[PDB]
């Protein structure tokens, strides 16, 4: 009965660092590779970064490079994302996954963050 | 780099009949199923291990395909083939 948590949804001007959290419940945090990714609605979904909380060792995406800060702390399992210099087409959907084994993709979403921003 | 051969995305299946979402590249074929407003779910990961809870209709074709051997409520929602961190063209089901 493992599941995944997250903070809600949040509405600030462009330009402004965001920080998002999550969580995982029922099941060990060490060994277990989470990931961030967010979708334009009806689109495809374009992965962000990965990060493994055994050692903190995080990796990122092409388009998020310098615009992207992953922490975890498996101590309260809980993984903070934090984004700074925010765009304007940057209004879409965000899941926080948690994939098994540590191994890749991912099974478990999130509780749908909604990060978006207003011209 | 890599760019999946996937099938049309439309279809007009209503219950009870066999349909198959292509899906063809190399190996693996993960697929999920994508919640309108809900989280999303997972239906098969490598396209040969069934997890806990998921239908026994839900049947990969290796290194294809979701072949499904019909469409009921609890499966409906768009298809997404994704892979190792790339992802597919999806294909979203409906009935009429
Ligand atoms: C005779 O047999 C019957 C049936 O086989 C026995 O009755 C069953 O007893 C078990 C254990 O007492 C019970 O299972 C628990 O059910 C609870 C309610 O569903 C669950 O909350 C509980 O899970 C917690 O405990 C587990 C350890 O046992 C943990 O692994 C699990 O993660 C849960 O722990 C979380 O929650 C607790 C409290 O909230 C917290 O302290 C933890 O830190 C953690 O956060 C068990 O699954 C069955 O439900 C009983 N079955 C029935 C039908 O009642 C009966 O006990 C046997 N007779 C004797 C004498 O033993
Ligand atoms: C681009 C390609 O070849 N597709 C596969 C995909 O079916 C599979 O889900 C993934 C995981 O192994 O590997 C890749
Ligand atoms: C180097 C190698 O094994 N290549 C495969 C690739 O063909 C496939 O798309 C995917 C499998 O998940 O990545 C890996
Ligand atoms: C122990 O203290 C350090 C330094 O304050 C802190 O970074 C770390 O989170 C603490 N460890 C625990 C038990 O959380």
């Known amino acids: 009965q493992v599941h995944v948590m997250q903070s809600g949804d949040q509405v600030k001007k462009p330009g402004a660092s965001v920080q998002v959290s999550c969580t995982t419940s029922?099941?060990?945090?060490?060994?277990?590779?989470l990931h961030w990714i967010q979708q334009v609605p009806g689109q495809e979904p374009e992965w962000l970064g990965w990060?493994?909380?055994?050692?903190?060792?995080?990796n990122y995406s092409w388009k998020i490079r310098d615009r992207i800060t992953m922490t975890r702390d498996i101590s309260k399992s809980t993984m903070y994302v934090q984004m700074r210099g925010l765009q304007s087409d940057d209004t879409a959907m965000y899941y926080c996954?948690?994939?098994?084994?540590?191994?890749?993709?991912?099974?478990?979403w999130g509780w749908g963050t909604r990060i978006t921003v207003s011209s | 780099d890599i760019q999946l051969t996937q099938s049309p995305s439309y279809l007009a299946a209503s219950v009870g009949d066999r349909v198959t979402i292509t899906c063809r590249e190399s190996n693996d074929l993960n697929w999920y199923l994508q919640r309108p407003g809900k989280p999303p779910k997972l239906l098969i990961s490598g396209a040969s291990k069934l997890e806990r809870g998921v239908p026994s209709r839900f049947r990969g074709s290796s290194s294809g395909s979701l072949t499904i051997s019909g469409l009921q409520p609890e499966d409906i929602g768009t298809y997404y083939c994704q892979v190792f961190e790339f992802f597919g063209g999806g294909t979203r089901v409906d009935i009429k």
């Open positions: 996954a948690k994939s098994r084994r540590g191994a890749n993709w991912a099974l478990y």
């Open positions: 990060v493994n909380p055994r050692h903190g060792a995080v």
């Open positions: 029922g099941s060990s945090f060490i060994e277990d590779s």
